[PDB]
Amino acid sequence: APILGYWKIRGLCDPIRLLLAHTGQEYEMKEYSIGPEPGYDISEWLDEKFNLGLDFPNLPYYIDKDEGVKITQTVAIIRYLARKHGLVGESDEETIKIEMVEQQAIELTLTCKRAFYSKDDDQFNQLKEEILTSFPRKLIDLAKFLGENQYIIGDRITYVDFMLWSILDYLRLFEESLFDEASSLKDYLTRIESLPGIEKYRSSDDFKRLPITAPMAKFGGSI
Amino acid sequence: APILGYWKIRGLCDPIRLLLAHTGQEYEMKEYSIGPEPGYDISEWLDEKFNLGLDFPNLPYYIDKDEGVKITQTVAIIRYLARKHGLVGESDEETIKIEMVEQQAIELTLTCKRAFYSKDDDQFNQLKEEILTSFPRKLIDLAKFLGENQYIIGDRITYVDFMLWSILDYLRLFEESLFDEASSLKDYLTRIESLPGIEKYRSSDDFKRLPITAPMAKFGGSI
Numbered sequence: 001a002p003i004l005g006y007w008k009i010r011g012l013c014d015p016i017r018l019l020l021a022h023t024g025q026e027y028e029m030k031e032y033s034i035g036p037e038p039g040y041d042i043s044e045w046l047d048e049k050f051n052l053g054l055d056f057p058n059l060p061y062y063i064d065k066d067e068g069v070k071i072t073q074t075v076a077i078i079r080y081l082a083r084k085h086g087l088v089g090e091s092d093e094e095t096i097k098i099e100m101v102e103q104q105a106i107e108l109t110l111t112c113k114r115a116f117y118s119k120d121d122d123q124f125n126q127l128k129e130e131i132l133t134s135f136p137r138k139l140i141d142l143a144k145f146l147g148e149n150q151y152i153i154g155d156r157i158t159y160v161d162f163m164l165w166s167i168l169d170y171l172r173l174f175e176e177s178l179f180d181e182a183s184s185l186k187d188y189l190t191r192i193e194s195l196p197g198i199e200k201y202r203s204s205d206d207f208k209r210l211p212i213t214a215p216m217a218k219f220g221g222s223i
Numbered sequence: 224a225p226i227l228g229y230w231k232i233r234g235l236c237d238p239i240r241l242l243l244a245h246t247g248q249e250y251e252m253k254e255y256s257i258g259p260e261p262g263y264d265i266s267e268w269l270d271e272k273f274n275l276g277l278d279f280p281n282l283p284y285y286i287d288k289d290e291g292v293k294i295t296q297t298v299a300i301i302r303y304l305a306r307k308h309g310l311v312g313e314s315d316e317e318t319i320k321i322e323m324v325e326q327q328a329i330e331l332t333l334t335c336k337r338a339f340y341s342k343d344d345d346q347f348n349q350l351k352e353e354i355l356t357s358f359p360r361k362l363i364d365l366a367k368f369l370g371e372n373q374y375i376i377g378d379r380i381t382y383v384d385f386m387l388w389s390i391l392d393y394l395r396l397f398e399e400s401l402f403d404e405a406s407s408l409k410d411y412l413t414r415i416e417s418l419p420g421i422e423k424y425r426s427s428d429d430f431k432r433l434p435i436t437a438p439m440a441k442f443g444g445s446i
């Protein structure tokens with residue numbers, strides 16, 4: 001069975017786990033603990049980081065011994081899984097649209113990540129201000145792009161829908177009022193979370209015990 | 224002829240222009256000025272941002288009316304150009320390696336971008352310390368991955384080589400000590416800069432007048 005490695009949080013790995021839940025692919029989840037404050041001990045990972053044969057040691061990682069693959073980098077992993085499962089564009093037109101949204105979703109995710117793991121209240125507040133001021137426009141742009149479609153390229157779900165749903169879910173949990181100009185994104189959230197494999201994953205004990213972020217974060221550190 | 228839009232700096236668009244120089248593709252470079260300090264006026268861009276038909280208005284953009292494409296997001300543009308010019312993987316093994324390095328190059332680039340556009344000398348020094356402390360290990364990981372290869376996937380140059388060269392060049396200019404004695408990566412830098420289309424681009428007046436970063440940056444704002 002393939003092995004997915006990550007912290008016991010949703011974090012960056014969330015879209016990968018949603019894609020795997022949607023497809024029903026069998027895999028082993030290798031979870032690494034973060035110890036309690038103030039040490040936030042991460043020994044189980046630090047002891048393995050350099051002994052897994054990874055070219056770029058990091059979390060998340062995906063190892064399938066049977067297929068001969070070992071991959072790090074969230075985007076490389078999710079694209080690999082997307083190709084394996086057919087959740088990619090069937091035209092260059094579709095691929096351009098998927099890749100533009102992939103990058104827009106990552107841009108929002110990184111901005112949130114930087115905010116969530118801010119060093120102090122000053123920095124957290126500065127980055128929250130930038131989010132509250134710039135994200136409304138970006139959510140309108142995403143809504144316009146989606147239009148009347150079920151998913152990003154139309155009727156067929158692709159890997160980018162999982163990346164967009166994860167960040168939109170985090171934003172709904174961080175500031176719900178951000179969707180007051182794009183109710184279609186609320187329907188998008190309901191559509192994807194209602195898909196059977198995703199609903200089963202989200203209603204599982206394993207998912208419900210996951211904080212969004214690691215214990216040191218200014219937001220999401222506790223379920 | 225296709226149009227590539229961006230500020231009059233190397234910045235994020237550098238790998239795209241290196242790829243286009245390598246391929247010899249004819250294109251119009253649409254350059255947007257940044258006015259002098261203190262106003263750093265960008266009105267030529269702000270006036271057009273929303274009138275170009277872009278789904279996610281941003282710089283860089285790539286517009287080819289003849290092919291019917293309009294793209295933003297740097298990674299979406301370079302991947303589109305790579306597929307068009309045959310600079311992508313010829314196997315899933317090659318594709319996984321290219322995508323892992325693509326993500327590693329972007330991670331290094333975003334860390335440098337955050338440092339260069341730091342607001343205060345405290346943030347610049349904090350981010351510089353993280354780079355001086357973490358980048359040596361990452362450069363060794365990249366050198367180990369390259370091994371005795373001319374390029375990331377061997378004798379054949381791919382789009383990721385332009386992305387990696389751009390960030391390594393910036394790092395060479397920022398902190399040579401990371402590269403001054405980094406032997407294999409220096410040879411990699413020299414190999415790519417010796418390609419005829421790259422030589423021609425780097426020795427052109429248009430390139431030589433480009434600062435790395437915009438005028439507000441703590442590093443790179445000057446030729």
Ligand SMILES: N[C@@H](CCC(=O)N[C@@H](CSC(=S)NCc1ccccc1)C(=O)NCC(=O)O)C(=O)O
Binds near residue numbers: 010
């Ligand atoms: N470039 C990589 C980069 C991989 C990377 O940065 N990994 C982090 C965990 S990742 C994390 S803590 N995410 C929390 C988070 C919260 C909210 C929104 C987004 C993300 C990590 O702990 N790595 C282990 C280590 O450094 O040894 C990728 O894209 O996967």
Ligand SMILES: N[C@@H](CCC(=O)N[C@@H](CSC(=S)NCc1ccccc1)C(=O)NCC(=O)O)C(=O)O
Binds near residue numbers: 106127
């Ligand atoms: N002005 C841009 C604001 C865009 C932006 O900065 N978003 C992310 C970085 S995400 C980024 S710049 N990725 C693009 C990229 C492409 C290729 C290589 C490296 C980086 C972010 O983290 N910013 C906020 C922060 O620093 O916390 C826009 O309007 O999209």
Ligand SMILES: N[C@@H](CCC(=O)N[C@@H](CSC(=S)NCc1ccccc1)C(=O)NCC(=O)O)C(=O)O
Binds near residue numbers: 234333
């Ligand atoms: N997600 C996008 C995000 C695109 C984006 O953030 N664009 C910036 C310029 S981008 C810039 S100034 N880069 C300098 C730089 C210097 C050194 C290293 C890396 C990058 C911008 O000003 N956009 C226009 C605007 O906000 O209206 C992408 O990936 O391309």
Ligand SMILES: N[C@@H](CCC(=O)N[C@@H](CSC(=S)NCc1ccccc1)C(=O)NCC(=O)O)C(=O)O
Binds near residue numbers: 074106350
């Ligand atoms: N800590 C990890 C990683 C080092 C790191 O954080 N690098 C970049 C972000 S680049 C990043 S986390 N991209 C992964 C990613 C994947 C999918 C969605 C969103 C983001 C960066 O800008 N760091 C400095 C900063 O944000 O100030 C490692 O050591 O590998």
